[PDB]
Homo-oligomer: 115 residues x 4
Protein backbone atom coordinates (compact mmCIF):
# COMPACT_ATOMS: atom_id res chain seq x y z
CA UNK A 1 0.00 0.00 0.00
CA UNK A 2 2.70 2.45 1.03
CA UNK A 3 5.17 1.16 -1.62
CA UNK A 4 4.41 0.18 -5.12
CA UNK A 5 6.66 -0.60 -8.10
CA UNK A 6 5.72 -0.31 -11.76
CA UNK A 7 7.90 -1.48 -14.67
CA UNK A 8 7.51 -0.74 -18.37
CA UNK A 9 9.26 -2.11 -21.49
CA UNK A 10 10.30 0.66 -23.93
CA UNK A 11 11.26 -1.83 -26.68
CA UNK A 12 7.87 -3.58 -26.92
CA UNK A 13 5.75 -0.70 -25.46
CA UNK A 14 4.18 -2.84 -22.79
CA UNK A 15 4.20 -3.46 -19.16
CA UNK A 16 7.25 -5.44 -18.06
CA UNK A 17 5.81 -8.72 -16.78
CA UNK A 18 7.26 -11.19 -14.24
CA UNK A 19 10.14 -8.96 -13.41
CA UNK A 20 11.79 -9.84 -10.12
CA UNK A 21 11.98 -6.97 -7.60
CA UNK A 22 13.85 -7.12 -4.29
CA UNK A 23 13.59 -4.41 -1.65
CA UNK A 24 16.22 -4.08 1.09
CA UNK A 25 16.48 -1.95 4.19
CA UNK A 26 19.82 -0.49 5.28
CA UNK A 27 20.75 -1.85 8.73
CA UNK A 28 22.90 -0.03 11.32
CA UNK A 29 26.03 -1.98 10.17
CA UNK A 30 25.41 -0.39 6.72
CA UNK A 31 24.57 -3.74 5.10
CA UNK A 32 21.36 -4.29 3.10
CA UNK A 33 18.95 -6.65 4.68
CA UNK A 34 16.12 -8.35 2.79
CA UNK A 35 12.83 -6.33 3.43
CA UNK A 36 10.34 -7.43 0.62
CA UNK A 37 10.19 -8.87 -2.88
CA UNK A 38 7.82 -10.15 -5.54
CA UNK A 39 7.40 -10.32 -9.34
CA UNK A 40 5.51 -7.72 -11.39
CA UNK A 41 1.99 -8.63 -12.55
CA UNK A 42 0.52 -8.70 -16.02
CA UNK A 43 0.02 -4.97 -15.69
CA UNK A 44 3.70 -4.57 -14.76
CA UNK A 45 2.87 -3.58 -11.21
CA UNK A 46 3.92 -5.04 -7.90
CA UNK A 47 1.63 -4.29 -4.95
CA UNK A 48 1.53 -5.47 -1.31
CA UNK A 49 5.28 -5.24 -0.68
CA UNK A 50 4.91 -3.83 2.84
CA UNK A 51 2.46 -2.11 5.25
CA UNK A 52 2.42 1.26 6.98
CA UNK A 53 3.39 -0.33 10.34
CA UNK A 54 6.54 -1.99 8.84
CA UNK A 55 7.63 0.78 6.46
CA UNK A 56 9.44 2.99 8.90
CA UNK A 57 11.74 5.86 7.97
CA UNK A 58 15.14 4.60 6.75
CA UNK A 59 17.11 4.02 3.52
CA UNK A 60 15.68 1.47 1.16
CA UNK A 61 17.05 -0.14 -1.97
CA UNK A 62 14.73 -1.62 -4.54
CA UNK A 63 16.19 -4.10 -7.02
CA UNK A 64 14.81 -4.62 -10.40
CA UNK A 65 16.26 -7.76 -12.14
CA UNK A 66 16.32 -6.17 -15.61
CA UNK A 67 19.00 -8.56 -16.83
CA UNK A 68 16.87 -11.69 -16.38
CA UNK A 69 13.98 -9.86 -17.99
CA UNK A 70 15.93 -9.04 -21.19
CA UNK A 71 17.58 -12.51 -21.19
CA UNK A 72 14.28 -14.28 -21.29
CA UNK A 73 13.25 -12.16 -24.30
CA UNK A 74 16.61 -12.96 -26.00
CA UNK A 75 17.97 -9.40 -25.97
CA UNK A 76 21.41 -8.50 -24.70
CA UNK A 77 21.18 -6.09 -21.85
CA UNK A 78 23.84 -3.79 -20.46
CA UNK A 79 22.86 -3.47 -16.79
CA UNK A 80 23.00 -6.19 -14.11
CA UNK A 81 19.81 -4.70 -12.59
CA UNK A 82 18.12 -1.28 -12.04
CA UNK A 83 18.48 0.51 -8.75
CA UNK A 84 16.64 2.88 -6.76
CA UNK A 85 18.06 3.85 -3.43
CA UNK A 86 16.14 6.40 -1.37
CA UNK A 87 15.19 7.65 2.12
CA UNK A 88 11.59 7.07 3.24
CA UNK A 89 10.65 10.21 5.16
CA UNK A 90 7.58 10.73 7.39
CA UNK A 91 7.70 14.50 6.74
CA UNK A 92 6.92 14.02 3.06
CA UNK A 93 3.77 12.40 1.62
CA UNK A 94 3.53 8.67 2.38
CA UNK A 95 2.63 6.67 -0.73
CA UNK A 96 5.71 5.83 -2.90
CA UNK A 97 5.35 4.60 -6.46
CA UNK A 98 8.69 3.75 -8.09
CA UNK A 99 8.30 3.52 -11.81
CA UNK A 100 11.06 2.18 -14.11
CA UNK A 101 11.19 2.45 -17.91
CA UNK A 102 13.50 -0.17 -19.38
CA UNK A 103 15.57 -0.39 -22.56
CA UNK A 104 18.43 -2.89 -23.12
CA UNK A 105 21.10 -0.16 -22.67
CA UNK A 106 19.18 2.40 -20.73
CA UNK A 107 16.67 2.84 -17.90
CA UNK A 108 14.93 5.65 -16.18
CA UNK A 109 13.39 5.59 -12.76
CA UNK A 110 11.06 8.07 -11.15
CA UNK A 111 9.42 8.37 -7.79
CA UNK A 112 5.83 9.64 -7.43
CA UNK A 113 5.21 10.41 -3.78
CA UNK A 114 1.56 11.23 -2.96
CA UNK A 115 -1.48 11.16 -0.61
Amino acid sequence: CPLMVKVLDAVRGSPAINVAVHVFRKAADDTWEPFASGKTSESGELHGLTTEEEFVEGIYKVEIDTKSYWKALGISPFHEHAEVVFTANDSGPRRYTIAALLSPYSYSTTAVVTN
Copy 2:
Protein backbone atom coordinates in the same frame (compact mmCIF):
# COMPACT_ATOMS: atom_id res chain seq x y z
CA CYS B 1 -11.04 4.16 -23.08
CA PRO B 2 -8.89 3.46 -26.11
CA LEU B 3 -6.59 6.46 -25.44
CA MET B 4 -5.31 7.62 -22.15
CA VAL B 5 -2.63 10.17 -21.21
CA LYS B 6 -0.65 10.25 -17.98
CA VAL B 7 1.73 13.06 -16.96
CA LEU B 8 4.28 13.10 -14.16
CA ASP B 9 6.46 15.88 -12.66
CA ALA B 10 10.10 14.79 -12.16
CA VAL B 11 11.00 17.94 -10.17
CA ARG B 12 8.36 17.53 -7.44
CA GLY B 13 7.87 13.72 -7.82
CA SER B 14 4.15 13.96 -8.30
CA PRO B 15 1.50 13.64 -10.85
CA ALA B 16 1.35 16.66 -13.15
CA ILE B 17 -2.05 18.20 -12.42
CA ASN B 18 -4.25 20.40 -14.65
CA VAL B 19 -2.00 20.01 -17.60
CA ALA B 20 -3.69 20.87 -20.88
CA VAL B 21 -3.61 18.11 -23.51
CA HIS B 22 -4.79 18.50 -27.11
CA VAL B 23 -5.11 15.58 -29.50
CA PHE B 24 -5.26 16.14 -33.27
CA ARG B 25 -5.92 13.86 -36.20
CA LYS B 26 -4.01 14.29 -39.47
CA ALA B 27 -6.46 15.11 -42.29
CA ALA B 28 -5.94 14.24 -45.99
CA ASP B 29 -4.60 17.80 -46.69
CA ASP B 30 -1.86 16.97 -44.11
CA THR B 31 -3.13 19.57 -41.62
CA TRP B 32 -3.89 18.69 -37.98
CA GLU B 33 -7.49 18.89 -37.06
CA PRO B 34 -8.76 19.12 -33.48
CA PHE B 35 -9.82 15.54 -32.33
CA ALA B 36 -9.97 15.68 -28.42
CA SER B 37 -8.63 17.56 -25.41
CA GLY B 38 -8.91 17.89 -21.65
CA LYS B 39 -6.82 18.66 -18.55
CA THR B 40 -5.09 16.00 -16.44
CA SER B 41 -6.75 15.05 -13.13
CA GLU B 42 -5.37 15.09 -9.62
CA SER B 43 -3.79 11.74 -10.40
CA GLY B 44 -2.17 13.24 -13.52
CA GLU B 45 -4.34 11.18 -15.83
CA LEU B 46 -6.68 12.17 -18.60
CA HIS B 47 -9.39 9.63 -19.49
CA GLY B 48 -12.41 9.70 -21.83
CA LEU B 49 -10.66 11.44 -24.74
CA THR B 50 -12.32 9.30 -27.42
CA THR B 51 -14.23 6.02 -28.02
CA GLU B 52 -13.49 2.90 -30.04
CA GLU B 53 -15.99 3.93 -32.77
CA GLU B 54 -14.25 7.34 -33.29
CA PHE B 55 -10.62 6.28 -32.87
CA VAL B 56 -9.98 4.95 -36.32
CA GLU B 57 -6.56 4.13 -37.76
CA GLY B 58 -4.66 7.29 -38.74
CA ILE B 59 -1.86 9.58 -37.48
CA TYR B 60 -2.53 11.37 -34.25
CA LYS B 61 -0.69 14.14 -32.45
CA VAL B 62 -1.12 14.63 -28.73
CA GLU B 63 -0.12 17.99 -27.27
CA ILE B 64 0.99 18.42 -23.79
CA ASP B 65 1.15 22.14 -22.72
CA THR B 66 4.27 21.69 -20.56
CA LYS B 67 5.17 25.36 -20.82
CA SER B 68 2.01 26.60 -19.07
CA TYR B 69 2.49 23.90 -16.47
CA TRP B 70 6.03 25.05 -15.54
CA LYS B 71 5.01 28.74 -15.80
CA ALA B 72 2.31 28.37 -13.22
CA LEU B 73 4.85 26.78 -10.83
CA GLY B 74 7.30 29.67 -11.53
CA ILE B 75 9.97 27.56 -13.24
CA SER B 76 11.51 28.44 -16.57
CA PRO B 77 10.90 25.74 -19.08
CA PHE B 78 12.72 25.04 -22.32
CA HIS B 79 10.04 23.41 -24.47
CA GLU B 80 6.90 25.05 -25.91
CA HIS B 81 5.04 21.75 -25.34
CA ALA B 82 5.67 17.94 -25.45
CA GLU B 83 4.76 15.95 -28.51
CA VAL B 84 3.81 12.59 -29.35
CA VAL B 85 2.99 11.83 -32.93
CA PHE B 86 2.06 8.25 -33.80
CA THR B 87 0.01 5.93 -36.06
CA ALA B 88 -2.96 4.16 -34.45
CA ASN B 89 -2.96 0.68 -35.99
CA ASP B 90 -5.74 -1.94 -35.80
CA SER B 91 -3.19 -4.75 -36.26
CA GLY B 92 -1.52 -3.96 -32.94
CA PRO B 93 -3.20 -4.07 -29.50
CA ARG B 94 -5.87 -1.38 -29.06
CA ARG B 95 -5.48 0.43 -25.73
CA TYR B 96 -2.90 3.31 -25.91
CA THR B 97 -1.51 4.91 -22.77
CA ILE B 98 0.85 7.80 -23.51
CA ALA B 99 2.89 8.62 -20.47
CA ALA B 100 5.10 11.75 -20.23
CA LEU B 101 7.74 12.47 -17.57
CA LEU B 102 8.46 16.18 -17.36
CA SER B 103 11.48 18.23 -16.28
CA PRO B 104 12.00 21.94 -17.12
CA TYR B 105 14.66 21.12 -19.78
CA SER B 106 13.80 17.57 -20.56
CA TYR B 107 10.90 15.18 -21.15
CA SER B 108 10.41 11.57 -21.96
CA THR B 109 7.38 9.99 -23.48
CA THR B 110 6.47 6.35 -23.75
CA ALA B 111 3.61 4.43 -25.24
CA VAL B 112 2.14 1.35 -23.52
CA VAL B 113 -0.09 -0.44 -25.99
CA THR B 114 -2.12 -3.31 -24.45
CA ASN B 115 -5.29 -5.46 -24.24
Copy 3:
Protein backbone atom coordinates in the same frame (compact mmCIF):
# COMPACT_ATOMS: atom_id res chain seq x y z
CA CYS C 1 27.76 26.19 -33.63
CA PRO C 2 24.71 27.66 -32.00
CA LEU C 3 22.55 24.49 -32.64
CA MET C 4 23.76 20.85 -32.36
CA VAL C 5 21.75 17.65 -32.27
CA LYS C 6 22.95 14.39 -30.76
CA VAL C 7 20.97 11.12 -31.02
CA LEU C 8 21.64 7.89 -29.12
CA ASP C 9 20.19 4.36 -29.51
CA ALA C 10 18.95 2.91 -26.21
CA VAL C 11 18.48 -0.62 -27.68
CA ARG C 12 21.99 -1.03 -29.12
CA GLY C 13 23.86 1.31 -26.69
CA SER C 14 25.37 3.26 -29.53
CA PRO C 15 25.13 6.56 -31.26
CA ALA C 16 22.18 6.71 -33.74
CA ILE C 17 23.91 7.16 -37.08
CA ASN C 18 22.39 8.64 -40.28
CA VAL C 19 19.28 9.95 -38.55
CA ALA C 20 17.58 12.66 -40.60
CA VAL C 21 16.86 15.92 -38.79
CA HIS C 22 14.74 18.80 -40.07
CA VAL C 23 14.48 22.17 -38.42
CA PHE C 24 11.65 24.67 -38.91
CA ARG C 25 11.07 28.22 -37.64
CA LYS C 26 7.55 29.41 -36.92
CA ALA C 27 6.60 32.31 -39.29
CA ALA C 28 3.96 35.12 -38.65
CA ASP C 29 1.04 32.97 -39.91
CA ASP C 30 1.95 30.33 -37.43
CA THR C 31 3.10 28.04 -40.24
CA TRP C 32 6.40 26.18 -39.88
CA GLU C 33 8.90 27.30 -42.42
CA PRO C 34 11.85 25.12 -43.38
CA PHE C 35 14.94 26.33 -41.58
CA ALA C 36 17.78 23.82 -41.72
CA SER C 37 18.41 20.10 -42.17
CA GLY C 38 21.01 17.36 -42.07
CA LYS C 39 21.85 13.80 -40.83
CA THR C 40 23.71 12.65 -37.76
CA SER C 41 27.29 11.38 -38.15
CA GLU C 42 29.07 8.21 -36.87
CA SER C 43 29.23 9.86 -33.46
CA GLY C 44 25.45 10.44 -33.48
CA GLU C 45 26.04 14.21 -33.74
CA LEU C 46 24.85 16.74 -36.30
CA HIS C 47 26.88 19.90 -36.52
CA GLY C 48 26.64 22.86 -38.91
CA LEU C 49 22.89 23.19 -39.08
CA THR C 50 23.01 26.99 -38.88
CA THR C 51 25.17 30.00 -38.03
CA GLU C 52 25.07 32.68 -35.27
CA GLU C 53 23.92 35.28 -37.86
CA GLU C 54 21.14 33.08 -39.29
CA PHE C 55 19.82 31.66 -36.01
CA VAL C 56 17.78 34.62 -34.82
CA GLU C 57 15.16 34.69 -32.03
CA GLY C 58 12.16 32.64 -32.87
CA ILE C 59 10.24 29.47 -32.11
CA TYR C 60 11.97 26.47 -33.65
CA LYS C 61 10.89 22.90 -34.20
CA VAL C 62 13.52 20.11 -34.54
CA GLU C 63 12.05 16.99 -36.08
CA ILE C 64 14.07 13.86 -35.70
CA ASP C 65 13.11 11.09 -38.12
CA THR C 66 13.09 8.32 -35.52
CA LYS C 67 10.60 6.09 -37.47
CA SER C 68 12.95 5.67 -40.58
CA TYR C 69 15.82 4.93 -38.21
CA TRP C 70 13.94 2.05 -36.41
CA LYS C 71 12.47 0.76 -39.71
CA ALA C 72 15.95 0.30 -41.31
CA LEU C 73 16.73 -1.82 -38.25
CA GLY C 74 13.57 -4.03 -38.75
CA ILE C 75 11.67 -2.47 -35.91
CA SER C 76 8.17 -1.01 -36.18
CA PRO C 77 8.36 1.92 -33.73
CA PHE C 78 5.48 3.83 -32.00
CA HIS C 79 6.42 7.42 -32.91
CA GLU C 80 6.33 9.03 -36.34
CA HIS C 81 9.23 11.22 -35.17
CA ALA C 82 10.54 13.02 -32.26
CA GLU C 83 9.62 16.81 -32.39
CA VAL C 84 11.43 19.26 -30.19
CA VAL C 85 9.78 22.70 -29.97
CA PHE C 86 11.30 25.66 -28.21
CA THR C 87 11.85 29.46 -28.20
CA ALA C 88 15.50 30.24 -29.00
CA ASN C 89 17.53 33.32 -28.14
CA ASP C 90 14.69 35.18 -26.44
CA SER C 91 16.76 36.22 -23.43
CA GLY C 92 19.78 36.72 -25.78
CA PRO C 93 22.09 34.46 -27.90
CA ARG C 94 22.74 30.94 -26.56
CA ARG C 95 24.32 27.76 -27.75
CA TYR C 96 21.84 24.81 -27.87
CA THR C 97 22.49 21.09 -27.80
CA ILE C 98 19.34 19.01 -28.32
CA ALA C 99 19.98 15.39 -27.31
CA ALA C 100 17.52 12.53 -27.93
CA LEU C 101 17.66 8.94 -26.60
CA LEU C 102 15.62 6.59 -28.73
CA SER C 103 13.75 3.30 -28.06
CA PRO C 104 11.09 1.74 -30.29
CA TYR C 105 8.20 2.89 -28.08
CA SER C 106 9.82 5.67 -26.19
CA TYR C 107 12.12 8.65 -26.45
CA SER C 108 13.60 11.18 -24.18
CA THR C 109 14.92 14.63 -25.10
CA THR C 110 17.02 17.04 -23.17
CA ALA C 111 18.48 20.47 -23.91
CA VAL C 112 21.88 21.76 -22.79
CA VAL C 113 21.83 25.56 -23.11
CA THR C 114 25.05 27.43 -22.54
CA ASN C 115 26.02 31.12 -22.74
Copy 4:
Protein backbone atom coordinates in the same frame (compact mmCIF):
# COMPACT_ATOMS: atom_id res chain seq x y z
CA CYS D 1 39.77 6.18 -21.97
CA PRO D 2 37.90 2.94 -21.56
CA LEU D 3 35.40 4.44 -18.98
CA MET D 4 33.87 7.96 -19.14
CA VAL D 5 30.95 9.40 -17.19
CA LYS D 6 28.84 12.33 -18.32
CA VAL D 7 26.13 13.91 -16.12
CA LEU D 8 23.50 16.45 -17.21
CA ASP D 9 21.02 18.56 -15.19
CA ALA D 10 17.45 18.28 -16.50
CA VAL D 11 16.19 21.19 -14.31
CA ARG D 12 18.76 23.78 -15.39
CA GLY D 13 19.51 22.38 -18.90
CA SER D 14 23.21 22.31 -18.22
CA PRO D 15 26.01 19.92 -17.55
CA ALA D 16 26.08 18.74 -13.87
CA ILE D 17 29.38 20.10 -12.62
CA ASN D 18 31.42 18.81 -9.64
CA VAL D 19 29.37 15.64 -9.23
CA ALA D 20 31.26 13.00 -7.26
CA VAL D 21 31.52 9.57 -8.88
CA HIS D 22 32.78 6.38 -7.24
CA VAL D 23 33.45 3.16 -9.06
CA PHE D 24 33.62 -0.29 -7.47
CA ARG D 25 34.46 -3.75 -8.84
CA LYS D 26 32.77 -6.82 -7.41
CA ALA D 27 35.36 -9.12 -5.72
CA ALA D 28 35.08 -12.97 -5.15
CA ASP D 29 33.12 -12.58 -1.88
CA ASP D 30 30.58 -10.53 -3.68
CA THR D 31 31.73 -7.41 -1.82
CA TRP D 32 32.24 -4.18 -3.76
CA GLU D 33 35.83 -3.12 -3.74
CA PRO D 34 36.82 0.48 -4.41
CA PHE D 35 38.01 0.80 -7.98
CA ALA D 36 38.24 4.42 -9.11
CA SER D 37 36.81 7.85 -8.33
CA GLY D 38 36.64 11.46 -9.43
CA LYS D 39 34.33 14.50 -10.07
CA THR D 40 32.74 15.75 -13.25
CA SER D 41 34.22 18.83 -14.96
CA GLU D 42 32.61 22.06 -16.30
CA SER D 43 31.44 20.05 -19.30
CA GLY D 44 29.74 17.49 -17.01
CA GLU D 45 32.29 14.86 -18.05
CA LEU D 46 34.69 12.75 -15.98
CA HIS D 47 37.67 11.40 -17.84
CA GLY D 48 40.69 9.44 -16.60
CA LEU D 49 38.96 7.14 -14.16
CA THR D 50 40.99 4.11 -15.25
CA THR D 51 43.27 2.70 -17.94
CA GLU D 52 42.95 -0.14 -20.52
CA GLU D 53 45.41 -2.26 -18.48
CA GLU D 54 43.62 -1.71 -15.16
CA PHE D 55 40.03 -2.05 -16.41
CA VAL D 56 39.81 -5.82 -16.66
CA GLU D 57 36.66 -7.96 -17.06
CA GLY D 58 34.45 -7.78 -14.07
CA ILE D 59 31.19 -6.48 -12.68
CA TYR D 60 31.44 -2.77 -11.96
CA LYS D 61 29.24 -0.37 -10.05
CA VAL D 62 29.33 3.40 -10.84
CA GLU D 63 27.79 5.43 -8.06
CA ILE D 64 26.91 8.97 -8.90
CA ASP D 65 26.40 11.22 -5.88
CA THR D 66 23.21 12.83 -7.15
CA LYS D 67 21.89 13.69 -3.62
CA SER D 68 24.89 16.04 -2.73
CA TYR D 69 24.52 17.68 -6.13
CA TRP D 70 20.78 18.54 -5.60
CA LYS D 71 21.37 19.52 -1.94
CA ALA D 72 24.01 22.17 -2.87
CA LEU D 73 21.31 23.60 -5.13
CA GLY D 74 18.70 23.74 -2.25
CA ILE D 75 16.73 20.80 -3.50
CA SER D 76 15.83 17.75 -1.40
CA PRO D 77 15.99 14.95 -3.99
CA PHE D 78 14.39 11.43 -3.87
CA HIS D 79 17.46 9.28 -4.62
CA GLU D 80 20.49 8.73 -2.40
CA HIS D 81 22.51 8.30 -5.62
CA ALA D 82 22.35 6.91 -9.00
CA GLU D 83 24.04 3.40 -9.18
CA VAL D 84 24.96 1.93 -12.52
CA VAL D 85 25.84 -1.78 -12.42
CA PHE D 86 27.17 -3.73 -15.36
CA THR D 87 29.55 -6.47 -16.59
CA ALA D 88 32.46 -4.90 -18.50
CA ASN D 89 34.71 -6.45 -21.13
CA ASP D 90 33.13 -9.89 -20.99
CA SER D 91 32.89 -10.27 -24.77
CA GLY D 92 36.29 -8.47 -25.07
CA PRO D 93 37.64 -4.90 -24.46
CA ARG D 94 35.19 -2.02 -25.05
CA ARG D 95 35.04 1.68 -24.47
CA TYR D 96 32.15 2.70 -22.12
CA THR D 97 30.41 6.02 -21.73
CA ILE D 98 27.90 6.07 -18.88
CA ALA D 99 25.59 9.10 -19.20
CA ALA D 100 23.08 10.18 -16.52
CA LEU D 101 20.33 12.82 -16.77
CA LEU D 102 19.29 14.07 -13.37
CA SER D 103 16.05 15.52 -11.92
CA PRO D 104 15.17 15.82 -8.23
CA TYR D 105 12.84 12.79 -8.28
CA SER D 106 14.05 11.02 -11.33
CA TYR D 107 17.10 9.97 -13.29
CA SER D 108 17.85 8.23 -16.48
CA THR D 109 21.04 6.41 -17.43
CA THR D 110 22.28 5.19 -20.73
CA ALA D 111 25.43 3.42 -21.90
CA VAL D 112 27.25 4.01 -25.19
CA VAL D 113 29.53 1.01 -25.80
CA THR D 114 31.94 1.15 -28.69
CA ASN D 115 34.62 -1.23 -30.01
